Design a protein around this ligand. Structure first.
Ligand SMILES: [Zn+2]
Lengths: 245, 46, 201, 94, 121, 147
RNA sequence: UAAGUCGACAAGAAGAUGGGCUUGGAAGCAGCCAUAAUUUAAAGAUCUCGUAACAGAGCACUUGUUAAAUCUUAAAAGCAU
């Protein structure tokens, strides 16, 4: 029979309860920051359900008109506008920035049979991770120089984040003109082609979304800086220009 | 008001308070409810 | 308590004067607990209270703030008077600077109110008397306490003013005691937005 | 906070500046129907390289104009002042 | 030949506009592949099972080891780091972006029971 | 408050009637104008077809109504070739668990989702997720789905 | 339990859908049966009201604000009311 000291192999000792959504959602953001290269942070102001659907309706429509005939993976539906927990999403940054996995020493663990097997606890919800982020955050001025510090003001109030699977400037123009239009660089969709955009429900929903800052390859970027990235027709073509020189 | 030997909350607004306790008596336990005045109950007899 | 920790912002003009631990001799008691006379003077008037000695005031004159603290959080008597003494200072500060007001609404056909002087029953020279025609056979006249100003912008609207909240709100309850709101038509005297739920029929 | 009595609000701040944090929270308290009621709000974002002093602008329905610096006073202190003027108006109306 | 409806079947009562005819079924091959896998979610005598069901299971289970008898802790209750890596690639990225959506439904099913039970009390 | 009302009316049948009359005649809005204004919206549908409508009556008795596609239950039954029962309209199963009225194949399900995509408010929902929203409703109206 | 406990406060609480049956009417909420799904920060074919029936107000549920550095909630036991 299972002994008392036995711990499930898929449930190492965590720093705090894992059943609660507070910690279960922290494990998601920790992985979102690693698999999402291009991330835009917005601010939502008490948007309604129907308005949320309408706001997410223009993205899907606007992001379906991006030409991708090179047989590349179908990155047109993994782009979601997700409302995240600002408080628990603040710990996510710290975990990536201030926790080094390679600094954990493996220990012997008991399986169902009771035999001792070496194991290392490097999960984000471990007591070692919690201790690292806390001690690292003790220094205030040094944290401001890090990328996390350049985003600490952003993580205040309700925040809605847009997640792109890859850094495709084409996918940004289709999402940067529907959520933060600024002609002539990123003009809003036309009225005679996209009447759904200028609806009473949707139009009133886009006024409550403000793009305060953006994060790219783990680097803080100002609002004006995002325009420079979106201005590029494509990341691939940009490299060829330097080769001709 | 209803004087029971077993007073219980009958809604979320019912509160248990001990009133009329002073230097001369111990008071009674009351169930006071602003939402429904039918939930007013007392525990003990004068 | 979570309210006793909050500092007390002293607005411009308000001046707090903390006394010294004193004991008034009481022949009826063998030992009186020391107290501290606190005066809160300002534009509108001056209020005073005597707090227990175990309460300590960190009167910051530089930043114009004053935080309270007790000598033992484990005692029930010190935890209670900590939050209470803070709630009074908050009223004293916001009562001597801005002032406390109470609005009474008279609902019901035939309910009026006038502010007239009754020199016969004056408890202090110039006392104002609120005369209420609450469908009674006799007249209802109550002299305003010394320190309060009563006026009637409209016949069915009384406006009490004073620096002591306990005095203003206690006098408003005396007026409301004549006609307590009923749940069938809403007739009565409502104090400071008080409302009553009506019946279907 | 009571927002019904506020006509217009114009905030000019920099996101990266820590002082502007107070200005950002103020924008969140506004209700959702504030746009439908007719209130006008214009937000300006400063460059990151150089940051000017944050500016806060408020107007009540009585024509009064309030202007308070964001750096000196915190967010909690800003909420206090706006409620007082919003309160006296309510007592006056009644 | 996997669908009961062959090409050319008249789709009944599926047109509400005047100047058009009821839709006619198209070839099965043209239809998207996902339409053939979205149907994966549809879910004395007792004495007879006690003779065989109870016995056969004990035979196959081979209750001599304590590896297949583990609790099999649900994913919605695990703490293992999700298979996400930094700069792992678009393959690793997408493949890593699927387990986060599979954990989403796991916790979702847990809310139904908690809400359905909360409303029963 | 701009009250909203739900009423199922006929395609080209707009006039004071049990469905139309009492739904909005009492609130105050000028109904006769709504009857002649609904015909212009519904002039390409079979006469008598039921058409859900969410009329939003703003203050001052100004009414703006958004016509919607036929009910999903109305299409599943009409497409399943169910036997007409009481009231002259195809009735659903009395016991969805035990009884079965029709067998609607997946080739029909893929179509009822496209016509339900015409609504702008439902035009963003991918069709992959919409075909299973109707297969989930066929279990409550007693319709079985055959591959 | 600073990954903000607890209380309060602000908003949200999607869609197919007015589930089918039922009844003069039954639209989450007379009753009968079903109640796998879907999409979301979340959201029961519905827990407490409400309507002739709709509508409408809360809850479960979800985010934010304030704010605890031995200060959260429950069970049992001792002694009292
Ligand atoms: Zn009660």
């Amino acid at each position: 029979r299972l002994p008392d000291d036995y711990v499930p192999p898929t449930q190492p000792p965590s720093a705090r309860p894992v059943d609660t959504r507070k910690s279960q959602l922290l494990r998601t953001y920790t992985s979102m920051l690693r698999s999402t290269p291009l991330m835009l942070i917005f601010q939502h102001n008490n948007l309604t359900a129907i308005e949320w659907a309408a706001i997410r309706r223009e993205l899907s429509l606007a992001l379906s008109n991006v030409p991708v005939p090179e047989g590349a993976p179908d990155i047109t539906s993994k782009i979601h506008l997700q409302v995240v927990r600002t408080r628990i999403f603040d710990v996510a940054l710290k975990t990536v920035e201030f926790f080094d996995p390679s600094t954990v020493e493996p220990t012997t663990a008991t399986t169902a049979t009771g035999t001792k097997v070496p194991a290392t606890y490097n999960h984000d919800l471990s007591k070692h991770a919690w201790k690292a982020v806390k001690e690292a955050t003790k220094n205030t001025e040094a944290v401001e120089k890090t990328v996390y510090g350049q985003l600490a003001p952003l993580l205040v109030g309700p925040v809605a984040i847009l997640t792109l699977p890859s850094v495709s400037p084409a996918h940004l123009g289709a999402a940067l003109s529907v959520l933060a239009p600024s002609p002539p660089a990123f003009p809003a969709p036309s009225r005679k082609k996209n009447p759904g955009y200028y609806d009473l429900t949707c139009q009133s929903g886009l006024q409550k979304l403000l793009l305060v800052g953006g994060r790219i390859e783990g680097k803080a970027f100002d609002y004006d800086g995002i325009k420079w990235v979106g201005g590029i027709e494509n990341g691939i073509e940009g490299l060829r220009a330097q080769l001709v020189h | 008001m209803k004087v029971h030997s077993a007073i219980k909350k009958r809604c979320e607004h019912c509160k248990v308070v001990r009133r009329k306790a002073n230097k001369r008596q111990n008071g009674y336990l009351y169930i006071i409810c602003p939402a429904n005045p039918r939930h007013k109950q007392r525990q003990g007899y004068r | 308590s979570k309210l006793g920790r909050t500092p007390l912002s002293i607005p411009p003009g308000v001046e707090i004067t903390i006394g010294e631990p004193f004991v008034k001799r009481d022949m009826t008691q063998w030992k009186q607990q020391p107290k501290r006379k606190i005066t809160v003077q300002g534009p509108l008037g001056q209020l005073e209270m005597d707090i227990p000695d175990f309460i300590k005031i960190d009167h910051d004159a530089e930043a114009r703030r004053a935080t309270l603290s007790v000598a033992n959080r484990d005692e029930k008597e010190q935890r209670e008077m900590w939050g209470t003494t803070w709630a009074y200072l908050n009223r004293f500060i916001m009562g001597v600077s801005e002032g406390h007001t109470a609005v009474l609404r008279l609902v019901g056909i035939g309910y009026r109110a006038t502010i007239d002087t009754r020199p016969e029953k004056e408890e202090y020279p110039g006392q104002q008397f609120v005369c209420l025609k609450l469908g009674f056979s006799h007249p209802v006249e109550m002299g305003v306490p010394k320190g309060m100003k009563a006026s009637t912008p409209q016949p069915t609207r009384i406006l009490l003013e004073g620096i002591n909240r306990e005095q203003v709100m206690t006098f408003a309850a005396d007026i409301r005691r004549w006609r307590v709101p009923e749940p069938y038509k809403g007739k009565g005297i409502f104090v400071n937005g008080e409302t009553i739920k009506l019946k279907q029929k | 906070m009571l927002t019904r009595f506020i006509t217009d609000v114009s905030t000019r701040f920099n996101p990266f500046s820590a002082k502007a944090k107070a200005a950002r929270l103020f924008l969140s308290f506004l209700p959702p129907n504030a746009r439908s009621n007719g209130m006008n709000i214009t937000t300006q974002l400063l460059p990151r390289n150089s940051t000017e002093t944050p500016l806060l602008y408020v107007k009540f329905k009585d024509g009064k104009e309030m202007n308070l610096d964001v750096e000196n006073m915190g967010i909690k202190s800003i909420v206090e002042e706006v409620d007082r003027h919003s309160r006296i108006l309510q007592k006056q109306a009644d | 030949a996997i669908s009961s409806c062959p090409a050319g079947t008249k789709l009944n009562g599926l047109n509400y506009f005047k100047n058009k005819a009821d839709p006619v079924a198209l070839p099965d091959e043209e239809y998207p592949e996902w339409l053939w896998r979205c149907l994966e979610v549809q879910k004395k005598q007792r004495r007879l099972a006690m003779k065989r069901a109870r016995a056969q299971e004990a035979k196959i289970l081979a209750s001599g080891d304590l590896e297949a008898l583990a609790p099999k802790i649900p994913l919605q209750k695990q703490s293992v780091n999700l298979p996400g890596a930094v700069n792992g690639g678009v393959q690793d990225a997408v493949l890593a972006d699927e387990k986060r959506e599979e954990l989403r439904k796991a916790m979702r099913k847990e809310r139904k029971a908690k809400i359905k039970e909360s409303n029963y009390l | 408050v701009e009250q909203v009302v739900k009423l199922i009316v006929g395609a080209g049948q707009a006039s004071p009637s049990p469905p139309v009359g009492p739904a909005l005649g009492s609130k105050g809005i000028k109904s006769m104008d709504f009857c002649k204004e609904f015909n212009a919206r519904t002039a390409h549908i079979n006469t008598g077809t039921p058409m859900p409508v969410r009329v939003t009556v703003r203050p001052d008795r100004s009414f703006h109504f958004d016509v919607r596609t036929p009910h999903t239950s109305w299409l599943l039954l009409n497409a399943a070739e169910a036997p007409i029962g009481k009231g002259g309209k195809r009735k659903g199963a009395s016991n969805p668990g035990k009884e079965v009225v029709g067998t609607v194949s997946l080739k029909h399900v893929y179509e009822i989702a496209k016509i339900k995509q015409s609504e702008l408010r439902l035009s963003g929902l991918p069709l992959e997720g919409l075909c299973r929203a109707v297969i989930y409703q066929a279990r409550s109206i007693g319709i079985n789905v055959i591959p």
